[PDB]
Amino acid sequence: LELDVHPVAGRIGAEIRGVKLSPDLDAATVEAIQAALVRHKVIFFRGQTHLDDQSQEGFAKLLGEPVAPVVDGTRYLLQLDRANSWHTDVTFVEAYPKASILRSVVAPASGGDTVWANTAAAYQELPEPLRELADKLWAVHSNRVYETEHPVVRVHPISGERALQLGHFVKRIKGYSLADSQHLFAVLQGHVTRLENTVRWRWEAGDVAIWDNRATQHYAVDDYGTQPRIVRRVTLAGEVPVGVDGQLSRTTRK
Template structure:
């Protein structure tokens, strides 16, 4: 249920990602807010022109993303590529895709729905995966085409102790090779990077499992044992209690933290589905527990 909070009376108590928090928010831009899942996600209903979301609002949005993994902005109007780039650029430095070095807003259509119908974290095959992903819905099917997000930080916290201790010391090689095969794009360069399985978020102290479909191999294990461990941890991340499902409306924007979430675009539609997506660069490479000072 959404609760309207008058601007002058708004108040919010925020907790770490994955914990239930009170409704309402103390901001200058006014909102209706609710939580579509107790473990991940917050919905903000915008009243007014989307481009009124300037630096003060973006500070609130960054805080909400940090607290809840993904923020859904409802009531926005579809933006032009230039407007969308200006909007997303307030979150940080924009990352340009290897296939579109001159275009910030990547168009995601129904043509790639099968390659997006996997649980994944964007760009983990890079040494510096994007910190934020920002996506806006433009054209949508009459039904279907939802996107799901999973809370990889809550998943880490709920691991049994033996599995958590094992995860703390593992490193994973990520690759874009599977994407090249699915999209029949052998011409694209193979990109690989090794990251800790448990990523530490310095600004919050949160720990999250860094996996997803780009995770190719756990270092130091046989192919069979690596695949079994990846499947075990991945299944835990995407268990229903860690997941939220978002039903899009035209103009909706989702902003999420790739360090603490995974997402999955549900391919249950045949009509046109067009989105725009922008990546925002991180401040540093993924940090593991071994990287922390003693």
């Protein structure tokens, strides 16, 4: 099964046309969506104006297990109405989400974009000696309580692609002074956010984005002032990250 797939930037992002998201999608469609998700890291569906809270949740169950103050009439749907900092979702926990499904309900006429970065492409572009170092690093992620140690490089459980696991929740690279930690983090994270590794989406009401949280970071642009912006999100449960040597992440505090 071949979806009508339209890449947005050169290294990340694709719009999928001809698909009406719902709880009733067949297996071939769901599988093709999951494949496009892994390949493109963030995928976009426009004109999903029939989708409401319950059907967004029902659609989400087809891709994984939703995780649990929620939108009335639902168990897992959350409203956001700001995250202008580069991050991978909830990495201060051990088994953080594998994906989110985010729908635009009210969209600013100007501003309000979201940007995603491909952390697998960011890893791949490092010179070999720098990949080898990144393969050995561990970082402490925190919500400063919750603290988790994750490998800086995560091997994706479906594709096997290696991806940098960094972003806003990183407190420090384990085993380094603060000064060295800052420099090493600035190098690796700088590759994540390099423009070539990103795609910026301008939202219209009824757009839905789905991203693979295991191989992305994102950033919500806070340039829209008091213009109302309302989005609704379902988050899907993910796995404990595995590093390049097979070691697993571990919570070290609370």
